[PDB]
Design a protein around this ligand. Structure first.
Ligand code: C5F
Ligand code: C5F
Length: 273
């Protein structure tokens, strides 16, 4: 129907609580850091090569242990960014268990849904820690400027800017964590992924989440009448954004002998698009 019964309201709260439990950086926390109203101690700003190398003095143990300290600056940056993606994949994998029906799926279908869904979710949630000038890193303790990322040498300067472009329009929708949690659940449940076995079952799982998403958006943002259709379009945009990101990763991986794709991320991108 069009009214939120108790089972739907409970489902929405369960997804929201799993989102808060599994993702350390939520939008409320990110925006207070980015706003600077709860503290006069801002994140360390990485805006050029000098401040990058300053920040990396704190990270020396991790860079040394990973054999990255002497790699080119661009490679060092996106090695750390890869490690962050790996953490978020792990968190999304645990989050998906809270989606009613997900754990009941064939294990191969769970793997397929997460394979194609995680980076759409990652770039959706990445918007929460982005403003027009840069993005929070290191659990909100650092802030790497958008211009410094564009200043990197090709093709590394082409990686993050499309994600900033998406985030600025996504953030204009003014979603809160309760919306984003259901949006991320809907992303994970897409029944259109390549190689899914039990499509019918997955589509019924997806329909339940998307129904709760619509009713929740209508209740939580009553003045933005078509916010739900707007978000359906954002899901399509994310699929295109990830398709292009994966293609660019393949190009870079093949023409950059000293940059290494993280093993876990290797399997994700393997035969993706
Ligand atoms: C603190 C650490 C290593 O996370 C990081 C560290 C560095 C970065 C990137 C390079 C800048 Cl600083 Cl732009 C992102 C996440 C961690 O996960 O423990
Ligand atoms: C957002 C992020 C970090 O993008 C990248 C960017 C660069 C790389 C590294 C250099 C090769 Cl291409 Cl080996 C892998 C992934 C990701 O996909 O997790």
């Amino acid at each position: 129907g069009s009214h939120m019964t108790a089972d739907l309201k409970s489902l929405a709260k369960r997804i929201y609580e799993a989102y808060l439990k599994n993702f350390n950086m939520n939008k409320v926390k990110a925006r207070v850091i980015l706003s600077g109203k709860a503290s006069n101690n801002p994140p360390f700003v990485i805006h050029d090569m000098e401040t990058l190398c300053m920040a990396e003095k704190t990270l020396v143990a991790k860079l040394v242990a990973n054999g990255i300290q002497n790699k080119e600056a661009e490679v060092r940056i996106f090695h750390c960014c890869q490690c962050t993606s790996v953490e978020t994949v792990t968190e999304l994998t645990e989050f998906a268990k809270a989606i009613p029906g997900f754990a009941n799926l064939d294990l191969n279908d769970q793997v397929t849904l997460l394979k194609y869904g995680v980076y759409e979710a990652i770039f959706a949630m990445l918007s929460s820690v982005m403003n027009k000038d840069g993005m929070l890193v290191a659990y909100g303790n650092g802030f790497i400027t958008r211009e410094f990322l564009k200043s990197l040498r090709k093709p590394f300067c082409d990686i993050m800017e499309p994600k900033f472009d998406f985030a600025m329009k996504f953030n204009a929708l003014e979603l809160d964590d309760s919306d984003i949690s259901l949006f991320v659940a809907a992303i994970i449940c897409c029944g259109d992924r390549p190689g899914l076995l039990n499509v019918g079952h997955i589509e019924k799982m997806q329909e339940g989440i998307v129904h709760v998403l619509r009713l929740h958006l209508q209740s939580n943002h009553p003045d933005d009448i078509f916010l739900f259709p707007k978000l359906l379009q954002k899901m399509a945009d994310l699929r295109q954004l990830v398709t292009e990101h994966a293609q660019l990763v393949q190009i870079i991986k093949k023409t950059e002998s000293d940059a290494a794709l993280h093993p876990l991320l290797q399997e994700i991108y393997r035969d993706m698009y």
